[PDB]
Amino acid sequence: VCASGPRTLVLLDNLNVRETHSLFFRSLKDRGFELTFKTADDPSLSLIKYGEFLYDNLIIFSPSVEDFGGNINVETISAFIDGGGSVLVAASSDIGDPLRELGSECGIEFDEEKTAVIDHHNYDISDLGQHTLIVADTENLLKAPTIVGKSSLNPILFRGVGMVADPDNPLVLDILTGSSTSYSFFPDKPITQYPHAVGKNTLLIAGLQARNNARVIFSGSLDFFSDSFFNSAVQKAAPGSQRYSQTGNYELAVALSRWVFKEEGVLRVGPVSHHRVGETAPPNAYTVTDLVEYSIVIQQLSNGKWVPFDGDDIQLEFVRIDPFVRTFLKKKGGKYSVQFKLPDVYGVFQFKVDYNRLGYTHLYSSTQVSVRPLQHTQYERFIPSAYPYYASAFSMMLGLFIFSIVFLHM
Amino acid sequence: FNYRTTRFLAEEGFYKFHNWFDDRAWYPLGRIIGGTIYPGLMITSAAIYH
């Protein structure tokens, strides 16, 4: 079961893109996606009908188009991402304003039109002589196995517009950074001003994980997905550089597409059970310093079948305003559970699980539990240390009665 | 506040009312109703009602 349905809409600036990118589309079709190809400017385009989403995934391979046909608009795409749809965007030097605006909403800042990434040291030998076709080293690749694939990759060719991730937005993912020497500027015009992107700040590919878990990937270069790069060999122009039979573009593209479409890293939270130790049911309210058992189950989507999750870093918290207790949840019997003693302070406590990890879906669970003070009956009785006090009160009654008997009949 | 307490005491009984802890107020700290109140007014109303 795929978290996102196979229905996919493809937007192409020109029909020829399908032929040039046949390898990418064929690999996607082989996975069971139902692709439909329409021109980006086509008037009939629509995403929402009567409040329902016509398509589950959108791929915009329309870098040069100034405006979208029909009802598609930057607001509509933003709503679509909020709905949980996955979006893929491919850019180029001809980027129109809507693509830049869409990146702005997502926190990824595209550079101005006509700019290109310039690398004078790592540009491929095949480059036209403008040093804009850069051989991106795998070292810059993000250290996330789920997103990029466990397998190693050969150097990948990128040619396109650099973008900068906004620092303020935490969710932004720096999937592929540029080289230390790379920068984004207008090649013809001298660099009087500070570059928009300089050094490793420049981003070639970046990803976003929304709070609703929608995933969007922005690529600086449309050509990266082109069949030409996939088959072309790579050798750096600089002397002493090895020549590789094939690029890593094809392998990297396959891994990214799987991540965007919720084929990897998807996690679900099942029932959570809490009860007093030795009890099968949760009490209405717990007592101070009582011992309780907390159990939760988490699953992972592998190959479309849910299986027990293997994560070992999960941490449970008992919180009132700030976390009183935090501990790891042990993996026992296919479930994550721990037993602990409640704090000595009463209040409206909440159990919390916040297992957020890079590349995986963000899981949050909260259950409200009230802890109450001890009842009057529960207090200790017949304390041995208090025996002298006990003796006095009993003694007084006996003396008083004896006095009454003697006094009356004296 | 007195009205809500009076209803709880009559329906629930004195002993439960004595140990009543309310979690619906002063979130998230909570309040101990039993030990922070004056029972005189509530008891008189409940006794006549019975």
Side-chain angles (χ1 to χ4, degrees), chain B residues 12-25:
Chain B
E12 301 293 343
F14 173 77
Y15 282 120
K16 291 181 194 165
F17 167 83
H18 182 240
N19 297 125
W20 179 21
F21 162 78
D22 182 17
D23 57 349
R24 299 297 299 278

Side-chain angles (χ1 to χ4, degrees), chain A residues 42 105 122 143 229 280 303 307 340 342 357 377 381 385:
Chain A
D42 193 303
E105 302 319 317
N122 305 267
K143 186 62 63 202
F229 290 6
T280 187
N303 302 338
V307 293
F340 74 104
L342 298 190
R357 295 297 173 256
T377 70
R381 279 276 296 294
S385 309

Side-chain angles (χ1 to χ4, degrees), chain B residues 4-14 17 42-43 46 50:
Chain B
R4 174 175 175 244
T5 55
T6 300
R7 178 179 284 180
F8 181 97
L9 163 65
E11 300 174 356
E12 301 293 343
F14 173 77
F17 167 83
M42 282 70 76
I43 288 173
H50 291 311

Side-chain angles (χ1 to χ4, degrees), chain A residues 136-150:
Chain A
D137 292 331
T138 187
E139 294 153 54
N140 308 295
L141 185 61
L142 177 63
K143 186 62 63 202
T146 293
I147 317 175
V148 309
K150 58 205 64 74

Side-chain angles (χ1 to χ4, degrees), chain A residues 68-359:
Chain A
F68 299 113
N71 298 311
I72 298 192
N73 188 3
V74 174
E75 56 87 3
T76 311
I77 298 168
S78 296
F80 179 89
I81 307 154
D82 291 349
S86 293
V87 177
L88 197 152
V89 178
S92 67
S93 294
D94 310 342
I95 175 158
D97 42 351
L99 290 177
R100 302 193 58 210
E101 293 176 51
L102 182 63
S104 176
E105 302 319 317
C106 287
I108 300 176
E109 310 179 13
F110 289 94
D111 208 352
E112 294 300 321
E113 181 160 3
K114 183 58 170 66
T115 64
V117 176
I118 307 192
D119 186 350
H120 298 115
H121 302 81
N122 305 267
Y123 66 94
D124 190 306
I125 186 169
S126 313
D127 177 89
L128 274 292
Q130 190 54 78
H131 302 168
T132 55
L133 168 62
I134 71 190
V135 179
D137 292 331
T138 187
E139 294 153 54
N140 308 295
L141 185 61
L142 177 63
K143 186 62 63 202
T146 293
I147 317 175
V148 309
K150 58 205 64 74
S151 69
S152 66
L153 297 169
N154 302 354
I156 62 188
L157 284 177
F158 172 91
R159 183 177 194 151
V161 161
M163 40 198 182
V164 174
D166 183 352
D168 80 350
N169 186 342
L171 315 188
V172 183
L173 313 171
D174 299 328
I175 300 167
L176 184 69
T177 74
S179 60
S180 56
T181 63
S182 65
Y183 64 98
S184 66
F185 207 78
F186 293 93
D188 54 9
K189 202 271 185 170
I191 185 156
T192 59
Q193 294 89 9
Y194 193 73
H196 176 62
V198 54
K200 288 192 195 168
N201 298 352
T202 310
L203 301 185
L204 316 183
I205 317 170
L208 179 77
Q209 173 79 17
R211 299 196 189 287
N212 79 98
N213 304 316
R215 289 173 181 172
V216 186
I217 291 285
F218 288 84
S219 168
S221 177
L222 172 60
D223 302 328
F224 168 90
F225 302 112
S226 75
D227 295 7
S228 171
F229 290 6
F230 280 18
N231 300 303
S232 182
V234 60
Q235 171 174 36
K236 301 199 178 164
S241 311
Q242 298 209 318
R243 169 155 180 109
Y244 292 89
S245 308
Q246 63 163 346
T247 47
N249 296 311
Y250 181 41
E251 297 101 304
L252 182 56
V254 169
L256 289 170
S257 175
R258 293 273 294 290
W259 185 85
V260 174
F261 298 147
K262 304 294 191 73
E263 301 289 324
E264 279 177 292
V266 188
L267 300 177
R268 172 168 69 184
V269 171
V272 54
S273 294
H274 51 58
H275 47 252
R276 288 170 155 173
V277 70
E279 288 193 42
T280 187
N284 177 64
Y286 296 90
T287 60
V288 162
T289 198
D290 197 357
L291 197 154
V292 303
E293 173 169 55
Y294 180 96
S295 300
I296 189 164
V297 63
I298 292 167
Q299 285 178 309
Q300 169 173 12
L301 184 74
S302 183
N303 302 338
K305 56 159 174 76
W306 295 103
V307 293
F309 185 44
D310 193 10
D312 188 17
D313 193 11
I314 303 175
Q315 285 184 334
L316 173 75
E317 290 171 303
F318 199 63
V319 182
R320 191 179 64 170
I321 296 166
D322 41 4
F324 279 61
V325 179
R326 182 186 300 128
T327 185
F328 293 95
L329 282 181
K330 308 307 298 154
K331 174 67 169 224
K332 170 191 56 63
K335 283 191 139 45
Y336 294 95
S337 65
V338 66
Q339 293 187 356
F340 74 104
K341 191 186 296 288
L342 298 190
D344 55 4
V345 175
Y346 55 81
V348 190
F349 292 87
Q350 285 183 352
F351 284 104
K352 286 202 174 193
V353 171
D354 192 8
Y355 186 70
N356 178 16
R357 295 297 173 256
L358 177 60

Side-chain angles (χ1 to χ4, degrees), chain B residues 30-49:
Chain B
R31 173 182 179 185
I32 307 174
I33 306 296
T36 62
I37 202 159
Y38 279 106
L41 176 65
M42 282 70 76
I43 288 173
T44 54
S45 299
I48 59 173
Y49 172 83

